[PDB]
A paper describes a structure:
As members of the Caliciviridae family, norovirus virions consist of an approximately 7.5-kb positive-sense single-stranded RNA genome linked at its 5′ end to a viral protein (VPg). This genomic RNA is enclosed within a nonenveloped, T = 3 capsid approximately 40 nm in diameter. The capsid is formed from 90 dimers of the major structural protein, VP1, in one of three quasiequivalent conformational states: A-type VP1 proteins make up the icosahedral 5-fold axes and form AB dimers with B-type VP1 proteins, whereas C-type VP1 proteins form CC dimers at 2-fold axes. Each VP1 monomer comprises an N-terminal region, a shell (S) domain, and a protruding (P) domain (subdivided into proximal [P1] and distal [P2] subdomains). P domains extend outward from this shell and mediate interactions with receptor molecules and cofactors such as bile salts.
Author numbering:
A (entry chain C): 30 to 531
B (entry chain B): 17 to 221, 229 to 531
C (entry chain A): 20 to 191, 199 to 222, 228 to 531
Amino acid sequence: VPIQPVAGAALAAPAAGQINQIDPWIFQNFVQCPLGEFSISPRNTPGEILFDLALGPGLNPYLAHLSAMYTGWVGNMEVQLVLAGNAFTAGKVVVALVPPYFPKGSLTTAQITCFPHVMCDVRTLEPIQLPLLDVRRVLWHATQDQEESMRLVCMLYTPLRTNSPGDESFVVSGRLLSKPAADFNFVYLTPPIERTIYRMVDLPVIQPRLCTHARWPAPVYGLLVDPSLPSNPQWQNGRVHVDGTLLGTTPISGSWVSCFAAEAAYEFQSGTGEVATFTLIEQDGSAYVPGDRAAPLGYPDFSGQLEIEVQTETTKTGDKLKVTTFEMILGPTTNADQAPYQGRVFASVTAAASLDLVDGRVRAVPRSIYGFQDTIPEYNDGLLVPLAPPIGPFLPGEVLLRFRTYMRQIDTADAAAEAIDCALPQEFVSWFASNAFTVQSEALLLRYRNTLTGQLLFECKLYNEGYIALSYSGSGPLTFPTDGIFEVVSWVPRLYQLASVG
Amino acid sequence: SGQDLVPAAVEQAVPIQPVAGAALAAPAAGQINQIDPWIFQNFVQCPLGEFSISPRNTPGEILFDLALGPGLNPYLAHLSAMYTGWVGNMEVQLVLAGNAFTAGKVVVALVPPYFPKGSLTTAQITCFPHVMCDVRTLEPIQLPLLDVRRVLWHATQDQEESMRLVCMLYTPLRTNSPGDESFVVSGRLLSKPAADFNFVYLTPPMVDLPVIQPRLCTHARWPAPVYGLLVDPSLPSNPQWQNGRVHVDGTLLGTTPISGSWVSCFAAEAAYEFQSGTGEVATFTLIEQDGSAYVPGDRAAPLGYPDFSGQLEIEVQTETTKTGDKLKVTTFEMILGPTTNADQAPYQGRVFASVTAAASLDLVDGRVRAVPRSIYGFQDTIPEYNDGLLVPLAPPIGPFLPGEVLLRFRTYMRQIDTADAAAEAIDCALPQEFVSWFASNAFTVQSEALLLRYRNTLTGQLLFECKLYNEGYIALSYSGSGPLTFPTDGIFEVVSWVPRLYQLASVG
Amino acid sequence: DLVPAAVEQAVPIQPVAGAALAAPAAGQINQIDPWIFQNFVQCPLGEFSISPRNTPGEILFDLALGPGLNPYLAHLSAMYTGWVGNMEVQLVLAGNAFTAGKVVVALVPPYFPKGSLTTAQITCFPHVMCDVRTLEPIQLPLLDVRRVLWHATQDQEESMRLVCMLYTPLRTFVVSGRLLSKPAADFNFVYLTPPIRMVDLPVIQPRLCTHARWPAPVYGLLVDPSLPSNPQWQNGRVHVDGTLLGTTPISGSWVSCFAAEAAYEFQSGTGEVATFTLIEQDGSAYVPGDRAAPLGYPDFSGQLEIEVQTETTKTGDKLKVTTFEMILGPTTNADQAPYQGRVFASVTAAASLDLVDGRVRAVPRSIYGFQDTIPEYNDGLLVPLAPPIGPFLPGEVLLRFRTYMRQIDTADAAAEAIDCALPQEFVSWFASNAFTVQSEALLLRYRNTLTGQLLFECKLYNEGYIALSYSGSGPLTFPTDGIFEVVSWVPRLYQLASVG
């Protein structure tokens, strides 16, 4: 390739306090890059980027671990592209050396050859060994942020011309392997901050039968997919990102789920009963402001007639403090002018006279539901508010995993419980919030495996928007046992195809 | 490397003398100009440099024709805007590493300047300094392209006469592989300057598409947002549409407008008369919409007139002489074609419209501009242009290779209809933004097709490739019978210059 | 010895290494054509002007070192990721014998706290005193004082800045100054890349345009000081790098239209009333955010007649187009809320039309009582709006683009002429090309295409409007067959020539 040599530690060593050698056995092994893997299919149009990997310590896991106890790094790497095709195949890839400070996205096929590049046939026997050099403007790179280093881009240059038997299409699968060059080292030995460097995402070791549902204060009963249900719900509770961004009205605590905290003004109306006007606050004691979310944190994101329980203090003799059940319609179209986005809602109970209740602070918890509807409630009296987006999109053949619990239902005819679903339990929401991981791809590959048997029940994908997708082409609902553990394998791209279940 | 049952290299014994490059030009150049050494160190591919060989190519078909120049190299084609001159030899490698199960030969020849440039035949191709390559050849085929000229240098802004590197299919591409498709060779052209290429004289200093999603566009045959992106095999292949027909270099066709609010509209001088039994009839003496008048020229109507048929309703700004009302907007019904009894003639610049009225509306005659309202009995055919007679018109959208279909950009019209509830799906070849883009930029054509590719850039899924010919229509390779749709969240990009013989990947 | 009382001005320098510092970590060092070092070529920012309106202390120009000062370097830099090394800048001033004035050209270093620069401080840098009466150009070096090895091209970080300011007031007329620039003998680029942009315009006559605030061809091209100079126009606003301000759409058919879900009901005394729940016009859905309305909503007041595709269940008719009346602003009584996504319209009908509720897209038909002011957005409440157009230098007025609207009017025969800042074509061009905005204004020249009659120079500011230096108070119309073409980037204190 037409590129000069790059001085690594030689240019760093005067303005660096220490120049820190790594184990010579790490220079002796090619380790797989965590995302550098592709499969060329014959249906791939040329121009498709196969991978795009930046130079850094995150290419190697041993360098990614070592870099926590260092201030800086500098140097070059060696890289191997491995292609698993045979003879009888015919296609080309081009691996380019993109510099730093070059734009990203949308690079055509003529442009990839205007770089330093190699062009290699899928029939290549040996790996293609590549230099990934540290073309930099600084004297060394600081380990705890990621600036512009050289990328390594591979895109399909010439399509694949194979025979492909009828049962299964042929693919040329490529892997990318790497090790540091002889000129790679670290800079200044610091205390090993474990918190955030390149720490792989890990989930809590908790069974889903022990979890807590995130849209209703009840334990999780079911773990299942159902394509008959709407695969893009616009839910507002139990919405978290992976890197720790709470979406919508998602609370931290499981106690705040489907509850609200307010100041109640109690007034009697004849023919209706005791109507309480609730001025909403945040449930930790601070006030609520109409802002970037639909409601105060923990407000219910469903419709129907909810019975709430409020701690009522009365002025009547013979009683001081009690727990009173009110009724409150939620949505989607109500006549009581429910505006939780403004922080002012209304509830009522059928009372023959004035209950003589002291106007004051309450935290209403839900008691039961009448007429459950899996839709958004009325936040601004018919006017639509800023909402968290619907859950999706999916690759075709991938369905949304659902955590199911059952609600207390007022029902005069049927006894079948209202099964309400969320996308993630509250333990995973609080885990993602309290960890605040660094995200380096667009999907996490998860394995659900039973503990005592070791039986890998399914592999599944976790997206960064906070929802788990399975590869399931079946139409009926399939339940899964809630005794296993979700474990993280790796970062995988969003276009990654799974293995089907059922 | 995983087989040696293909040919490895070729011979390069081309019968030619070595040609001086920049060193002849240097005493008459007036400057010292250099290209940096790293451009000399790297075979890069120009966006002209893609071609394909199919089993449907007969021999004698030109796979490529590369006139020597700075435009065979993206580096050199970018540098060439800063200079008046160039000289020097190019070197070009041909990458056609066909599959093991294929057979065929190409002859790449060195055609001198001043040779009549079409049609070379298989008799003639070998009567030049040629080299005969196998399509299975594994390592690239490196070729000189020498600067045989009788001048000292070439002007860059003149497409002068230079040596052409010409490749035709010399033996047809066949395949002895057991029963499946037959393979298709995707060959690439790479080039760098040779050791003595140079430019001449520093001078004051390209094809693309706008970054617009197809849902963000303006439909060119009806004033509406584009709603659909689909081929449709049930529709005919060669419509003779007038609106939205623009070329790559910007040459408008027929009644093709530029402004987006000119579509399906017409400005004219309305003479208003009341007729008993019909109502209010306006005779429209047609003008142009920018304030000027209409002249019957190389088109059949004013710019922006509809190219469909039916009963169109129009909004006209009518001044009335009655009391209690001075200005209003009146709807006129107007049957269009192809054969009506109202003598509709936009070619002469005089049409007629009418509305049912029990009394005279007393409308002031004068300049109006009718915008469309609704359709009754929509027809995607040509209207009555010259009282049924012949007018000069745009050619139909074509020709296609067998297997290439027109990609239709769909929007939905407003319709008055007494029996059917479905809106009218009207299609165009290109939206108004691409028409304004081509009319504004005035691009330059290297070959008769632009291989384009459509990316959803937020998801990365490259959906297809497609060929934009220089007449301004986009074709895909599609074999299904049902209309297959594609999402309107994506981005088209220019990928390459290809001829008409490019083998597209079939979708659907 | 004799100290000479006349010493020719020369900036003393210490030499800066370019490629010698960069080369072991720049991946390749790229030599440029040796004749680029030979000729001073004009900066595409390099036009300024001094006037007696300027006060001593005004920054006349303010250049940054880099490849975008020489057009050969700015053109070559499209194929490189980086650059390094020194330049050389000439100044050309065009005064006559009876203008007095000194300007100072200083070499301000990077990471200087670049806020204020009074007149005493400007001589504490390496500088040169220039007289406004000099016949001959003035040469400066411009060195790559930096703390990095090389420079990203695509990312203007701090390099050495070249500031010029009025030292002594211009006393006595506008004095023109030009900047010319070449690379000095040490300049390379770094790392040849594919070429992935100097500001050019769409060659469209102003009569060939689509008006950005009403779906009509643009008829007029005029100034009018009688109108309010700083309107709060929400459509047709675009930044030069492509940032849309207000509710500015991309598609020309989106203008003054809306796409919604119509719910049809009948009311006695009013007629047929439709509730329109607004969405995005490209097929997607609308969410209230940091803009006042969905893309393409009518930003004017009055009574707009709309046309909706109505499906009816009556006999003898299935589909038709029905014209509704829809009040817009400024204060209405029909609960117009485009910001939250639900508006209302009505038509006078004696009986129920029995219309099917569903998705419609209403185009405008006519206006009754047109006003050029803002409508009612959130039932009179404050919404995120585009800022008012400005500011204006003393002596300029806003240029306005006129079209004529369809109007139902009972007494007046004059059609309502609506003005916009820029048409839709400039919006689509600027929003799809996404230029690097390299200074604060763009100098334009409205020149006739065929004959060559140049009418007026005008300043395209970055905020998406055109201001002309105009000393009168009345209107003035221009012929609409000319093409604006870009001369240079120009600073904000640039003084035009007065028209009219």
